């Protein structure tokens, strides 16, 4: 038995820690890639490349645990195609809820 793969839209219950629901350029980019890759957790830190604001986002998504290197690459580039247009330099740290749980719950 199995075949369980649910099209979960957006939890709107676990991400209640972030107050970044206020409409802004950051909100747009965040929600756009979030809707596509669907990360259970998304951390956004300022990591300026040197010229202007730059965003360094730690992603936590099961979509990437399948180890589809080229597939996650093509998907990311497709959405971040337009996304990047609004950012001088967007950096991302690819991680899963499995590895994220380690960091948050225990440490290692």
From TrEMBL:
Any one of the GO BP annotations = protein maturation
**Per UniProt, what is one GO molecular function of this protein?**
2 iron, 2 sulfur cluster binding
Q: Which GO terms describe its cellular component?
A: cytosol; nucleus
Looking up InterPro entries in the UniProt record yields: BOL2, BolA, BolA-like_sf
Name this protein carries in UniProt: BolA-like protein, putative
What organism does the UniProt record list as the source?
Plasmodium falciparum (isolate 3D7)
The UniProt similarity line reads: Belongs to the BolA/IbaG family.
Q: Where are the transmembrane segments?
A: none
